[PDB]
Amino acid sequence: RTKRQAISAEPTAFDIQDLSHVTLPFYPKSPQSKDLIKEAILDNDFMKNLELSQIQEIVDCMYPVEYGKDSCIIKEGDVGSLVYVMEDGKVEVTKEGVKLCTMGPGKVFGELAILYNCTRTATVKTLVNVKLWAIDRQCFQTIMMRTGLIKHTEYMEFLKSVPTFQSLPEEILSKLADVLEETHYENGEYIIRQGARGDTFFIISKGTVNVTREDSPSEDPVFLRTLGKGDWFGEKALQGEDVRTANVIAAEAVTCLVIDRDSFKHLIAEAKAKYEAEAAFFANLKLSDFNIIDTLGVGGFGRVELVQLKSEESKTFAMKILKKRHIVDTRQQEHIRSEKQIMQGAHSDFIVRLYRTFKDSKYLYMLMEACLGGELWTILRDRGSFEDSTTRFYTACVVEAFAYLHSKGIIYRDLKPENLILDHRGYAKLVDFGFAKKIGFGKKTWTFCGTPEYVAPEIILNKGHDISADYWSLGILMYELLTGSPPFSGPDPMKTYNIILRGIDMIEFPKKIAKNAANLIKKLCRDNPSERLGNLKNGVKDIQKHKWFEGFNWEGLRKGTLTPPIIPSVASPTDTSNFDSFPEDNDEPPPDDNSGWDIDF
Amino acid sequence: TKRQAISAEPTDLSHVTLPFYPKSPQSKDLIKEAILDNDFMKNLELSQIQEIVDCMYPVEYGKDSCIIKEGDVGSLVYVMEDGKVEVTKEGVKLCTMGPGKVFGELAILYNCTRTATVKTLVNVKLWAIDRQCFQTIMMRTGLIKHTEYMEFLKSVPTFQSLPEEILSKLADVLEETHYENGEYIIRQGARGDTFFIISKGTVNVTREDSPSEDPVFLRTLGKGDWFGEKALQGEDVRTANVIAAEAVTCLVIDRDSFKHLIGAKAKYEAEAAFFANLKLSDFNIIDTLGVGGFGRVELVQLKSEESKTFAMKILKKRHIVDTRQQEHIRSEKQIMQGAHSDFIVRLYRTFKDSKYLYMLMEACLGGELWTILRDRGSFEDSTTRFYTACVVEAFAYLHSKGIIYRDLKPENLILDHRGYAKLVDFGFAKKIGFGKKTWTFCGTPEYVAPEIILNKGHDISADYWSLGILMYELLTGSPPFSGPDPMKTYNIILRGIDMIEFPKKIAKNAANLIKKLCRDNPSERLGNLKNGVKDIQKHKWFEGFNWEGLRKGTLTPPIIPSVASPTDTSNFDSFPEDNDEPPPDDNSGWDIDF
Ligand SMILES: Nc1ncnc2c1ncn2[C@@H]1O[C@H](COP(=O)(O)OP(=O)(O)NP(=O)(O)O)[C@@H](O)[C@H]1O
Ligand SMILES: Nc1ncnc2c1ncn2[C@@H]1O[C@H](COP(=O)(O)OP(=O)(O)NP(=O)(O)O)[C@@H](O)[C@H]1O
Ligand SMILES: [Mn+2]
Ligand SMILES: [Mn+2]
Ligand SMILES: [Mn+2]
Ligand SMILES: [Mn+2]
């Protein structure tokens, strides 16, 4: 027993762009010589396994060679690269000296040499004048390479054309090409019959077919359609058993590529699809498709009305409307602009979606999702204070929203119950991004903004601030939700700011606040932004890890399976019962502003 | 109730020299005291307070004039130096205010409306400063201080190594501490948790080498130097005194605040460099591990460590051009050097004179698996399961990068000294596309997949065919398809695995896997389906197998080879010396990567 020798033919660097530039020589032959070669090939144990198409390129490519009476065609020890077929004559083959075979015409020999550069095991020498056919290894692999690649890519442009097959990689689709079966039918043969159960899919590669169908059990079948090279039928079968709804009869000599479901199934994001569609709907809306039907809120910078589509009254939206003269007077152009940019680009279940903006010469219009469950501040007003477990639910929704915004480098900067709205399920979402800003990581911004009771001390002190300011506000929010009032507040803003600067540890916490809640509040309202929980290595995950949030069903909240603490009554998309009544803005409309600074609204 | 949000005007360029109004020391001390008396502004830091003091400007008002009228919008904060004013609201007199008191400071946060009227009772001298100039001070000094701080850090080796967003949090926790002349910042022998960076001044570092003698001068450290590193990794015992030589400020950080904010396998960046300065003559040949169609594989040893042995495959350059196999040797080098898998022999580097190519690889002294199979006859089911598992891992690595191996057989499986099997010989390996096919007839006859024989095109699924052959040979001592010559062997292969009567030696699960690996149609072979090679690891035969222990090298191999030394070639057959005439030279240039 001795080690086995590896062998190799010449490598290949041959692709689809080379099919047109290789050359397969053609030598004309009598039909009788072509069937002699065809029979000889089909008699060889190895070559009879090639495809009849490829066999009949080989016969066309073999060339004539004649030897006299006592000539030697193969020398033992020589290297071989040719396979031969004898036409006329007879030849005797000898090894080291023994007379081995004697073989006459119509037999293939030397065929190992079309696999690789063999050493010949015997010498074959003529006896009578012989006519041979030959093809050498290089041209045989060129046939195999060219025909195989042609057939393969032909198959894959057939599959790429089927809708059931459009959706899948180039890979995988090439295993599918290798699982096709070619089936040929003669004229009048039924490929498929109405009412038959089927598991096979058909693609017509050659010929044409007639699609007949009896509308009745006992009408005779009526003509319907004709399908040709490129058409398919039976696609229903690749998802399950298909009841064929028509006969398909071969109108001529037909070849189809056939695939059944089991071989298919052995080889087992709608993002720019789903959300691109919503974008189109909102894009071809004008301001003139809405009616104002009620008022959801009144703010410092704009009124928020409930609006209804004139053409689909199921579809209502919240519309924030801002006076342009007012935005210019308060010098808030870039704050409104970032409200638009950040809210439009945010895709968070805990942030109200901004679908688009409109504009006329007096107002800017922000069209967002309506949340008819109610403003959290009015709910806190009506109830006084929220239980520990109720506050935990709403605080968690803010925390999820902050996890999304802060991960994209965005500071929110106006947390407060007036800016938390309940949807119809009772889930809280952030509105009002008028102070939100996309800042760097590790960079700081300097605008003094917020709502006094909620402003972080580093904003008051003009020291620079970042997303950690939001965690300070989160602590204020918890304290207010749990007791009904925020911890820092005075009769005028300057007094309110001065109390904030004295810090959270100078406040006597009411006994209402559970120990874990008080602990989290104090860890969120540290004076130094670098000491605040949420601004450390693990970011917001440290807040979700606190004792107070231990036990909380974070993933039930994220998956929307968590039952909210307060279920709002919303009877219809028009139901504003969960909101206060507001009087009409009966003031004179502001001056027009066609300066152009709002070109991007 | 219900609260309204407020906002100042939003707003980098260094081009803004601040205005300066000269002031008496008395007037500058009057302004500073007033600021430090105001509940809000007393919380700003003193550096900024003296920029504000230097930047506010003088204003004079006459008798009976209003400095502020209720209802106006404010943007100025004031401090009076001389005079008296009356504060009124809706005509009611609230108070009288004298010099040295800040008022109107709400207006430096945002445009507040004034809540009261301030009217002079006499001539009045005030200082005032605008919001849109207070913001500029706070921003400028704030950004200047910040970028200065982080340029102090990053110069520290203990820092530098971590993202910038982190070090800007680190800058925000450094505490400025000032020391006067002769003050000891730190003393030798003290236990400390603080790290220091000198921002102003310089210090003398003294140290007594004895308790008996006296602290000698050692060093002088100045603006930019640091000390007390070691304290940010744990308690540091100070190795010297640091005394302030002048008025000194240092930025100080203790370990607990450091750790509260914080919380790179450059070893092949290293070991790759080492292999680069080697010449093809720093080695000795010790013996020969094998002889192949291309060339001998010799064990070679580095002259300088003798601990370090390697396998070196040597190929006759024109033997390769004779066989027209240049582009296969190119892919052997490319793929084996680029492969990083514990189940594939590493190719560290290439050499070449112009007559030979030299492939320097990891030596595996456990022995050729074919020689072990030769000596033992056949492997147990569990023994074969181990070696097949290493091949499967190797194929998982190669096939996941689009590379077909194409010469699996026991002659190409080598055991290392632990007994773990690895693939050698990548002469037929090729990086082909995904879903693409290649056409070169190559392999070893008993192992060649039928789609290679028939020239139908092949891809990595051919390796799964060979894997089934391997299992069959390991389990029985001979492969399933074999005849007295090639062509007979190839014709038997074409008749398929189901025409072979399996010996009863082969367990049912193994036979099932072999037959599932050697399907004629490559799209039917286990490993070529949706889950890829993971389907093979899922088979009944591999159920119970410790795949994760194998990958971690904790699984005990079925055969532990005796290797006494890195020079021990006992586990290999002996081969005679390469005594034929040297081949001709080849400077064609196809060996560009020598
Ligand atoms: N999308 C919405 N769905 C339901 N109610 C909403 C929505 N957006 C706003 N509101 C209500 O309208 C009020 C004013 O909206 P907001 O967007 O907060 O205006 P503003 O002028 O920015 N207020 P502020 O900036 O805090 O002074 C909110 O406080 C909510 O009560
Ligand atoms: N890294 C190695 N460590 C130890 N022994 C090795 C190593 N690589 C190869 N060998 C041995 O040397 C023999 C020849 O090496 P190989 O790399 O297989 O040469 P080849 O010319 O490609 N043989 P083949 O093409 O199959 O005829 C192998 O079969 C092993 O027995
Ligand atoms: Mn608001
Ligand atoms: Mn707002
Ligand atoms: Mn080998
Ligand atoms: Mn090899």
Author numbering:
A (entry chain A): 73 to 340, 354 to 686
B (entry chain B): 74 to 84, 90 to 341, 356 to 686
Reproduce text from the manuscript describing this model.
PKGs belong to the AGC family of protein kinases and have N-terminal regulatory (R) and C-terminal catalytic (C) domains. The R-domain comprises a leucine zipper (LZ) domain, a linker region with an auto-inhibitory (AI) sequence, and two cyclic nucleotide-binding (CNB-A and -B) domains. By analogy to PKA, the PKG R-domain is thought to bind via its AI sequence to the C-domain active site to form an auto-inhibited R:C state; binding of cGMP to the R-domain destabilizes this state and allows active kinase to phosphorylate downstream substrates.
The C-domain binds AMP-PNP:Mn2+ at the ATP site with the DFG motif adopting an ‘in’ conformation. Both CNB-A and CNB-B PBCs adopt ‘open’ conformations with respect to the β-subdomains, similar to previous CNB domain structures without cyclic nucleotide. The overall structure is very similar to the PKA RIα:Cα heterodimer showing square root of the average of squared errors (RMSD) values of 1.95 Å for 546 shared Cα atoms, and it is similar to the CNB-A/B and the catalytic domains of monomeric Plasmodium PKG showing RMSD values of 2.91 Å for 504 shared Cα atoms. In the AI PKG Iβ C-domain, the glycine-rich loop contacts bound AMP-PNP, activation loop T532 is phosphorylated, and the DFG motif adopts an ‘in’ conformation with D517 coordinating Mn2+, so the pseudo-substrate is bound much as true substrates are expected to bind for phosphorylation. CNB-A in the auto-inhibited PKG Iβ holoenzyme adopts an ‘open’ PBC conformation typical of apo CNBs, and its contacts with the C-domain indicate that the orientation of the PBC is critical to auto-inhibition.
